[PDB]
Design an enzyme around this catalytic site. Structure first.
Site, mmCIF file in Angstrom:
data_model
loop_
_atom_site.group_PDB
_atom_site.id
_atom_site.type_symbol
_atom_site.label_atom_id
_atom_site.label_comp_id
_atom_site.label_asym_id
_atom_site.label_seq_id
_atom_site.Cartn_x
_atom_site.Cartn_y
_atom_site.Cartn_z
ATOM 1 N N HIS A 1 -17.772 -25.458 -72.282
ATOM 2 C CA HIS A 1 -18.561 -24.872 -73.557
ATOM 3 C C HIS A 1 -19.129 -23.557 -72.980
ATOM 4 O O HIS A 1 -19.530 -22.673 -73.658
ATOM 5 C CB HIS A 1 -19.766 -25.531 -73.933
ATOM 6 C CG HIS A 1 -20.795 -25.943 -72.877
ATOM 7 N ND1 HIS A 1 -20.922 -26.908 -71.942
ATOM 8 C CD2 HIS A 1 -21.955 -25.104 -72.494
ATOM 9 C CE1 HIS A 1 -22.166 -26.823 -71.340
ATOM 10 N NE2 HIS A 1 -22.632 -25.487 -71.609
ATOM 11 N N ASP B 1 -15.826 -31.798 -70.337
ATOM 12 C CA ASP B 1 -16.400 -30.702 -70.394
ATOM 13 C C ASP B 1 -16.349 -29.721 -69.273
ATOM 14 O O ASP B 1 -17.130 -29.643 -68.376
ATOM 15 C CB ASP B 1 -18.261 -30.770 -70.741
ATOM 16 C CG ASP B 1 -18.496 -29.231 -71.073
ATOM 17 O OD1 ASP B 1 -17.953 -28.502 -71.172
ATOM 18 O OD2 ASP B 1 -20.025 -29.332 -71.190
ATOM 19 N N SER C 1 -25.758 -24.718 -67.052
ATOM 20 C CA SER C 1 -24.223 -25.115 -67.177
ATOM 21 C C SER C 1 -23.480 -24.769 -66.531
ATOM 22 O O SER C 1 -23.322 -23.370 -66.204
ATOM 23 C CB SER C 1 -24.160 -24.739 -68.589
ATOM 24 O OG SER C 1 -24.615 -26.053 -69.720
#
Lengths: 14, 223
Positions: B41, B86, B177
């Site tokens: 992402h 991810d 992240s």
């Protein structure tokens, strides 16, 4: 209510 | 990072800052001299990557580098199902000569299990709602797959695992992240997602389950 934790984050209805 | 503290300088030498116009949006993890892992992402058409950093705002610390990366590839199953798989690999435009303060880290050869003791690091939001200038570090422990799948109903997938959720309210948060979760001294996960707000009692964060992707990672690196 879940968010992918980038900044800004990517958030979803749950 | 919620309820952590400043990391010891250069104690996480694999940490990568992903910035655009000198503003951080994610982290990554150096896994080979020319390769940085991050969350899918966090994908962009190009990257400026800060390596060997402690502060984001300070002058160029000895040994630090800002490196360009123009190529990256997301796992082919990213977001199928939603939030799953991810991860992406970023190929640096130049290999880095590993040094005292820029070093790769190996991926764990074992999958996570409840009770594993870990450390997560990043420049994401603090407990006080501010963004830090200095890399933050906090301890979190892995919880079982069954805990993760109950908490993150309906979207738990084996490409994910959970860590944290303690009464201590220690967690990753926005801006973390793609950064590392190191468990028993090996790279175990990448910060991926969680519930909002971060740092809730009883709610762990979710991390990309890298033990499931070692073959894909190395196939891509060798291609």
């Amino acid at each position: 209510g879940f968010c992918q934790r980038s900044i800004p984050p990517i958030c979803f209805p749950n | 990072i919620i309820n952590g503290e400043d990391c010891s300088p250069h104690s996480q030498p694999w940490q990568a800052a992903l910035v655009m116009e000198n503003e951080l949006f994610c982290s990554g993890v150096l896994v080979h001299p020319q390769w940085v892992l991050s969350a899918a992402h966090c994908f962009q058409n190009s990257y400026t990557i800060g390596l060997g950093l402690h502060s984001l705002e300070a002058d160029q610390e000895p040994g630090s580098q800002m490196v360009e990366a123009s190529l990256s590839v997301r796992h082919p199953e990213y977001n199928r199902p939603l939030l799953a798989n991810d991860l992406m690999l970023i190929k640096l435009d130049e290999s880095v000569s590993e040094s005292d303060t820029i070093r790769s880290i190996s991926i764990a050869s074992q999958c996570p299990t409840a009770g594993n003791s870990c450390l997560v690091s990043g420049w994401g939001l603090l407990a006080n709602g501010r963004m830090p200038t200095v890399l933050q570090c906090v301890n979190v422990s892995v919880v079982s797959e069954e805990v993760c799948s109950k908490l993150y109903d309906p979207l738990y997938h084996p490409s994910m695992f959970c860590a944290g959720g303690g009464q201590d309210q220690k967690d990753s948060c926005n801006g973390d992240s793609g950064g590392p979760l190191i468990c028993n001294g090996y790279l175990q996960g990448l910060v991926s997602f969680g519930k909002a707000p971060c740092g809730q009692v009883g709610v762990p964060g979710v991390y990309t389950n890298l033990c499931k992707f070692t073959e894909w990672i190395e196939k891509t690196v060798q291609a």
